[PDB]
Structures are given as structure tokens and as C-alpha cells.
Symmetry: D2
């Protein structure tokens, strides 16, 4: 390791890998308290710059590289895991913005977020894909399974949220083996993603990195979730 880069390491940076940078410069990708950072060895070999590289078009190439190499892989993986799960559709199947939501039937903020989304969902801009969990209340699993068990689960969920949970249900005698697997898989993915509270909302940034909102979003966060 070149001496200038060793000196930057002592400022609290752990190297991940080298990469090729412009202008004869050698790049080092690393982390500082778990955040990605970039170091550039100068052409002379005897200096190094810790910081952010921009190009002529004004792109922060260091941020682009950090996002591509550190954050995007795990985000794409979790996005696919949610896509392959047993989610309920709310909105148009071809709506261009996809938002995943982990929701419990006895969650007040879940219904409030449902309400917030209506202008985008009912205009075809956003589809919500709901992964039901049964974690808040003693009756949460049986009620979520009852929704999964109904003739049209996506419709029953819409009525359940729209009615504030006043929708009457025919709750089965037991949670079926298929319903237990759906709920336990969705709960596993929710726990993987680190939110213990519903709604747990996941969406993709324009840079293809996974983003999160937990609880009822404020106006700025809501508009970003919906793709404004």
C-alpha cells in the first residue's frame, strides 16, 4: 500500500478494493464508520486525495461508484426477494412506480399511509404491493390469514384498509399451512430489512438503491416514495 494511502487509513478508513480512476490515477474504495469513501492516488505516486471526484457533466463519480459497489447489490437482492414474495396488488399492474409495504391488519398508521397513496394509486402512477404480516396483536395472524384466504385477497385488503378495519370477515378455524408460510416468510423479510414497526415501506431511488420509510411518512418523504 502506498504510503499516502496508509496515512489516510490511519484517519479511520478501511479499504475494500482498488479500482481504476481517470487521468492515470489509482482509486481505492473504502469505508469510514461504515460509509463508503474514495481515495485517489496522484500521478506522482507520492500523494493521495481523500474526497469526491466530479466529471465535466457534474456527476459525483465517487457517489456513483459507492452506490454501485457497496449499496446497490444488496438493494437489488432485497427488491427481488420482495418481488418473489406473496404480495397483494393495490393499483395498476403496469404502474411505473413500485412500492412494497409490510403491513399488519391492526396497524393504524398502515391505513393512514394507504389513504395518503390514493392520488397516485387511483391515477395509475404508483402500485403498492403489500406483504402482510401478523406481528402486532394476538389476532393479527388469523386476521391477515383470513384476508389471504378470501376469494379476492387484494380486494379484501383494499376494503379492509379503506374501512379502517371495520370490514367484517369470515375468519377460518385455523391458519392454513400455506398461510402460515406466507406470513412467516414476509415476517422474515421484514426482520431482514430491520424495521420492527409497520408500515415498513420500501422503494427504489433513481440511482437503483433501496430506500426505506417506517411509520407514517411526512409530506416530503411521501412524495419521494410515490416518485414525485
Amino acid at each position: 500500500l502506498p504510503a499516502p494511502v496508509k496515512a489516510i487509513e490511519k484517519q479511520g478508513i478501511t479499504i475494500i478494493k482498488t479500482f481504476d480512476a481517470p487521468g492515470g490515477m489509482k482509486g481505492y474504495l473504502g469505508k469510514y464508520q461504515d460509509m463508503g469513501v474514495t481515495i485517489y492516488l496522484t500521478p506522482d505516486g507520492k500523494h493521495a486525495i481523500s474526497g469526491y471526484m466530479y466529471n465535466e457533466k457534474g456527476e459525483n463519480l465517487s457517489n456513483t461508484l459507492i452506490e454501485k459497489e457497496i449499496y446497490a447489490p444488496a438493494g437489488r437482492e432485497m427488491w427481488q426477494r420482495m418481488e418473489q414474495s406473496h404480495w397483494l396488488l393495490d393499483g395498476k399492474k403496469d404502474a411505473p412506480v413500485i412500492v412494497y409495504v409490510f403491513a399488519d391488519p391492526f396497524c393504524g398508521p398502515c391505513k393512514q399511509f394507504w389513504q395518503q397513496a390514493r392520488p397516485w394509486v387511483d391515477s395509475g402512477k404508483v402500485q403498492l404491493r403489500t406483504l402482510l404480516v401478523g406481528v402486532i396483536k394476538p389476532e393479527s395472524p388469523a386476521t391477515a390469514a383470513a384476508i389471504l384466504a378470501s376469494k379476492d385477497p387484494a380486494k379484501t385488503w383494499q376494503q379492509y384498509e379503506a374501512s379502517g378495519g371495520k370490514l367484517k370477515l369470515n375468519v377460518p378455524a385455523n391458519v392454513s399451512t400455506e398461510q402460515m408460510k406466507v406470513l412467516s416468510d414476509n415476517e422474515k423479510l421484514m426482520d431482514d430489512l430491520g424495521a420492527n414497526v409497520t408500515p415498513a415501506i420500501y422503494y427504489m431511488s433513481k440511482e437503483n438503491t433501496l430506500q426505506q420509510a417506517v411509520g407514517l411518512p411526512d409530506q416530503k418523504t411521501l412524495n419521494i416514495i410515490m416518485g414525485n
Copy 2:
């Protein structure tokens, strides 16, 4: 949303969630670009502080929270995918530090890393769990499968790396269907993790967050991989 927190939002922060803070302060967890941020609403309710909260023992509580809820979770599921793969054990089964490495039999730097790890593996501190791939050379798949086919594949791999790849092998007539599945599964997981160069080394920080090293680690990164 309180006016001081709205003001901080306008500096480029997107709020994820609220959380409980001490002293009658309310917390807001957010991000600036890719960086986690914590905001604390003052008891007067008319001010908010963006920064890092420390307790009496000197812990940076904001960093603990940001690591636990932002940086860490997305990689947890691929850590489990590595654990569920067909890895080879190098070290004690009860060694407290687990390190996964994606290695090709014809990778030079893999062998150098193997040697560098000896003090920690031999002490019982670290176990290396190797996920073989066959991606570098035409003979890489068959040689990797030959190691998997031997009577004690983990011992054969250790001897192979120790010998610098000179260890002679019984290379079977063909790659078995089980060996081909292992190699193809491992290669897909390696690709999903985002590093298509060996060695690709994965480990957990002292904050329990997934970390990566690609290529031969330098001395500082090696120490950190080994938990030292």
C-alpha cells in the same frame, strides 16, 4: 412536522422514521445522499439539532442507530445465503469469527490471503468458509469440482492453497451434477454480492454489518477481517 425539522429537510435530508430519544427530545432518522443522519428536536420544541448523540460511557448512539437500521440490514439475507451454501471449513467449527471467501483454484491472491490468515485460523479465533467457484481458467471448474470430489474436501483445499496450487489431484472424468450445482450456485451468489474478482471476502463488523474485501487485503484490512 416541526418547523426546525422541515428546515433541515430543505438542506437535502429525507426522513425515514421518528424514534425515541432521551431528555424529552424526539428523534428523526434520515439520510443525506447515501449517509445516515439523526436529528433531535429540542425540549423547547422550537429547535432541532442535526448531529451525533453521545452518552456518558462515550458511545456514539447516533452511529449505533444508523449502523443498526440503515447500513446493516440489506446484507443480512446474503450472509444467510452464504451460510446455507456448500462451503469448506478451514479452522475450528466453534471459532467465533466467521469469514466467507469466494475462491477459484487458479487465483494467486487467494493463496496469499490463505497464508496471511494462518495465525488467526490456527489460534481458533477465525474460521474461513470457502465457497469455490470456477471462473478464471478453462480448467477452473474441473479443478474446483475435483477438490469437492476428494475424500476430505476441506483438507484437500487447505493443502492445495498451502502448496500454491501445486498439490496433485485426482481429477474425475466429469464434473458431477452435485458439484456443478455447487459451483453454479456459488458463482450466482458471488455475482449477486457484486464482486466478480477473487478473492471476494465477506465478514461482519464489530457493529454486525456485512463487509467486503476484494483482492488481497492489506495489513489493516486483514486485521479487521480477522476481528483484530
Copy 3:
């Protein structure tokens, strides 16, 4: 000193003073390397936050404090030294934005800056106060003194810069003792300010802190110098 604040000290912060903060919080003003920092002790007294406090109107109060008490004061006395020097007035005497420039008659970039400043000087927004020096060419002292010796030195300087240095002058037999004192005093003050290249341009920020530009400013710096 409260334990959480001691913990922050150990991260490389040197405390300057305590100060009053809102909400029953105590403030500490300090520095990390050359950077000002504010720390706030929580009402619980067992936590402290290093960061930036905002109020309801969106003002960054920590930045206001850091600028007022750390970055600003040291330059205030040299701003007064410039005001007490023998400068030439270009613009209205009541123009609200004051800009000092150290200029040599044989400086090309000085003339380009003079032209760039015209819209603001002619509007009455900005007054340029020129402190002549004679440092570039053998004839620089005599030419500067000749401008000072003319019937209306400020007008002669404006015409000289406007002409690109082509304006013909009456250059006296010698530099008078008063002109030599002006030039030598101005050169010493220029040296004290730390820039030995002309134009050396000094102005006050909207935060009332002394600022410097050396050489011909680009468009953004020009706008900021001019108070725009």
C-alpha cells in the same frame, strides 16, 4: 466536565467556551482541527449532541455562532487597517458594499476585474477602494505614484484601468515622500494579509467575515464579491 462532553473531546475536539443554548441545554463551542463545532448537553444531562442547531425560521444557529466567534474576528483589525489606508474611491461614497483591491499599474488581471465590476459600481451598489502597490515592474512604483500625484487620482486610476494601461500620464521627476509612504504602507499591509499577487481582493461576507480573492475572480466569486 460532563462525561458525554468529555467523550466528544476524546474524538479530537478542543473546547473554547461554554454558552447558553435553548431548552435547558448547555452549549459548548469548540474546534476539530481548524473547523468550529458546537456541542449541546441534553436536558437529561447524561447525553450530548455534536452538530448544528436550527430554529423555527430555518437559521443554522450553530453556523451563525461559529462564524461570529471563530472564523470572523481575526480579520476585523486588518479590515480597519485597509479603511485607514490611502485608498482611491471608484463608485458612490454611500455604496453599501465595500470592496478593497490591492492593484499594481502593470497588472493585467486587475484591469479585467475593474471592467467586470462596472455593472455594480455604476449602479451604486458597490464601491471599489483601491490600495495601489508598486511591486511587479521596475516602473510600477513611479507609475503608481504618478497616478497618486495627478489632480484627481481616483479618476485617473479609473481612466487608466479602463484604457488597459494605455492612458498617458505625467510621471514626475521622483516619487514624493508621501507617495512612497503610501506605496510602502500598502505593500506591507498586502503582505500581512498573505497574498503577494495582484489583484488581491478583500470583501465582507453576508455573515460579516473577512474574505479574500486572489487573481481574476470567476463568475461565481465575482457575484459573491459584489454582494449578489
Copy 4:
């Protein structure tokens, strides 16, 4: 201005000047919210890095340049202004660490800081140079002038601080013209430096930049003031 540097300017940076950097790179010195920053244009001309450059010996050359060009000139100027003022010596005239203190006779913390300094002063390591002011109490000017008027002012000040202000004085009928000038000059310099409270303590860092402490220093700040 090269396009990559223009793009960094839009991140809130105001350019001061260019400078020559190593390895064919061009440097730009600027400020971000009144803090010095450095930008390096890459050899190709089509990228720029905002950040900190280190050399082989581990020196942060960006910090060195920022200190030399932005902070040190005004610090050296104020250091000289204090040196030329009418200060009172406390300690050995050849003590290697010099500390200036603005003090009022009716300031409790001034006497506490006096006490803190005794181990360094009485061993010849530190000299305190006290610039008296009369700003706190109605009798502060006459009492400070009485100390200045005494046969051995430095000794009378030592007795005054050591006795907790219990030292009896012969206060003259009026503040003399010479004493008024000393007090008003010292008050002007104190106001220049931005502290309205005594003790206002000024010392030089190892990097020849002016540093400040206001009020009674804590243990870390005290030891840094004294040159530990």
C-alpha cells in the same frame, strides 16, 4: 473555470485562488460555509476531486495550505498587536510558551485561571501576558488603572489575583490619560478578537495559528494552552 470545478462550486464552494499542486494537478483553494477547502483538477482536465491531499510522510497538505493561506496571516497579525500592547508579565521573560490573557479586576474566573497556571508559570515553562481591561463593573477601570499606576504593576497584579482581589490599593483621584489609552487599546483588541467575557485567553498552536479560550478552561483546554 474547468467544468468539473464549476460543478463543485455548485455544491456551495466559493473559490479564493488557484495554487500549484503535485503530479501535474491544478489546485483551487476555496471556502464552504466559511471553512477552507481544496479542489484538485485531475491530469486529464476533465475531472476534479474535492477533498484532502496527504503526502508520503502522512502530512495533510490541504490542512497545511488552508492554515497558511486563510488562518495564519490574521493570527500572526493579532499576535503581534498583542505583543506590542502594554501587557503585564507573569513568569519568566524567556519562558518558551507565551499566553495572552485579557482580564478584568472584578472577574472571578480570571483568578481561577491564574491559579490553574501556577505549575507551569512557577516552573518557567509558561509566561502569561495580561492585557488589563475595565469592562465588568463600575469600578473596573479605576481599579485596573490603579494597578497600572503602582510602582511595580506586574507584581501588584500578581498579588491582586493571588489574594482573590482582597489586596488593598491606593486608587488615584482619576484615571490618567496614559492609563485610559492602555485600557481603551486593550478593550479594542479584545473586541476585535470577539470575546465579550473575561478571561479571554489567546495562544498559538504548533501550526502557528491563533487559538482562543474564553472563561475558565477545562482540563484538556488548560493543558493545551500551557503547551502540554
